[PDB]
Symmetry: C2
Subunit: 278 residues, 2 copies
């Protein structure tokens, strides 16, 4: 029963994390704590809490768990892996550059690069509409959808959560805050969807804004960047590798095509070191 817990505040392109080393510290963090610490007015303030633990499994380097500020063990945009990797390196918990980490969904493989960015294996995309889930007659590269009188062409992709991706001529003037929420809860998305607005600059470079399910516009949705790159490659607009500029900064997406994993590379930054009493 420690007096206090040491933590590091980190962010991956503006998605901000409270990170805890529970390898070296012993404590049982209760849901109560997640909710107290997550509050931006009266707490530390974070999008997610990331807890690093000893591998409860062999041939794995670490375990981690991710909680949102409301206490639930959900991680929509999948950027926490990069903060984890930079954290265990920065805190000298490992000298490995290729790290295998046990997570809720399975095993994440990641690699820390010499320039300090982190490449994360995000798994293959799911493209069959009913699996996304999305209502359509058959799998297609693009779907026509009627949204309160507007006909939109939307690609639908799952990175483990549902995404719809629409191409825009101009990401800065795109209707993110108007059409985002209309598509997010469209009946054809029975579990709702993250909605990406994708501006193609050339086959290897795009700009992206994402309306995140349940949240609104975010600085950098990793799985959204993955989905948008996949959607653009499938339609021939993009070719791997794709540099994707988000409001929070730049991600690099690699995808060799159907059935192959999407690889996401980007930065993760330390903001400050903190101590919070239990």
């Amino acid at each position: 029963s420690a007096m206090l817990l040491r933590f590091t505040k980190m962010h991956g392109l503006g998605n901000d994390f409270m990170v805890l080393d529970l390898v070296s510290q012993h404590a049982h963090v209760q849901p109560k704590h997640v909710k107290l610490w997550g509050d931006r007015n009266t707490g530390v303030g974070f999008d997610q809490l990331l807890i690093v633990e000893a591998p409860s499994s062999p041939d794995v380097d670490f375990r981690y768990r991710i909680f949102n500020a409301d206490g639930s063990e959900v991680e929509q945009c999948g950027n926490g892996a990069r903060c984890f990797a930079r954290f265990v390196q920065d805190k000298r918990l490992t000298v490995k550059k290729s790290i295998r980490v046990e997570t809720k969904g399975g095993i994440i493989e990641l690699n820390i690069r010499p320039d300090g960015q982190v490449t994360v294996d995000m798994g293959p995309p799911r493209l069959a509409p009913a699996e996304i889930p999305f209502q359509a007659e058959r799998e297609a590269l693009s779907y026509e959808i009627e949204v309160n009188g507007q006909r939109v062409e939307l690609a639908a992709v799952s990175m483990g959560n549902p995404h719809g991706v629409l191409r825009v001529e101009n990401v800065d003037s795109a209707p993110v805050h108007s059409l985002g929420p209309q598509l997010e809860v469209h009946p054809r998305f029975p579990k709702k969807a993250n909605i990406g607005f994708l501006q193609v600059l050339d086959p290897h470079h795009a700009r992206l804004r994402v309306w995140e399910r349940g949240v609104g516009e975010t600085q950098a949705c990793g799985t959204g960047a993955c989905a948008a790159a996949v959607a653009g490659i499938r339609q021939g607009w993009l070719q791997s590798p794709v540099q994707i500029d988000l409001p929070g900064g730049r991600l690099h997406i690699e995808w060799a095509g159907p059935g192959q994993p999407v690889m996401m590379t980007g930065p993760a930054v330390r903001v400050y070191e903190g101590q919070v009493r239990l």
Copy 2:
């Protein structure tokens, strides 16, 4: 170099607090912007810097900065965090503190229960001072606003306030009427709009539409204005407990020309270290 800071809040108005008496650092607008960002920084509503006073007859100086860089002149929540900060970091052993601020020297008192009492100064009630367009000073004014009629009190605590009485703050039209009255042409410089529910002469609930901000949850000057408005109109009697969304304040006011004394909490959240 590595700077120590403390995160505090007063009724959910959250502060990064820096002791630059014991630490030597040149903090420039660029740092305030970087640290104040909620996505990439510490995250705060305001940065409070504690520094050495210019007068040896004053205990401390502080400066308060918004996340966007601009400096604040008076901030009741910040004064309460400042007081508990200098006490708990052992920078003073006094309970009655005088501090140099951008708006003059203010007197603070740390109570035995750990809350802090701030001298907020007297209210200004004449319309020209608010500023508020009115024929004469009055306890309340009837306003025609977009086909509606509203009765509000107008008070200045250094900034303008309009205060409306409501039967229940939870059903008050804070998001509807708030912005309509905020920019009403009879408030030349806009106004903070308070919605006041009287429980008894000594107890009330409040919600505040802050000008150029919206519903704020922790507007201490709004609580002062609402208590003053209610006391002048006889619905309340000093001292008044004011329940805001962020928590409870206690207001004392002896009447016209006398300062409003505001008492509330200040809470330490965590300790941090940031590279400058």
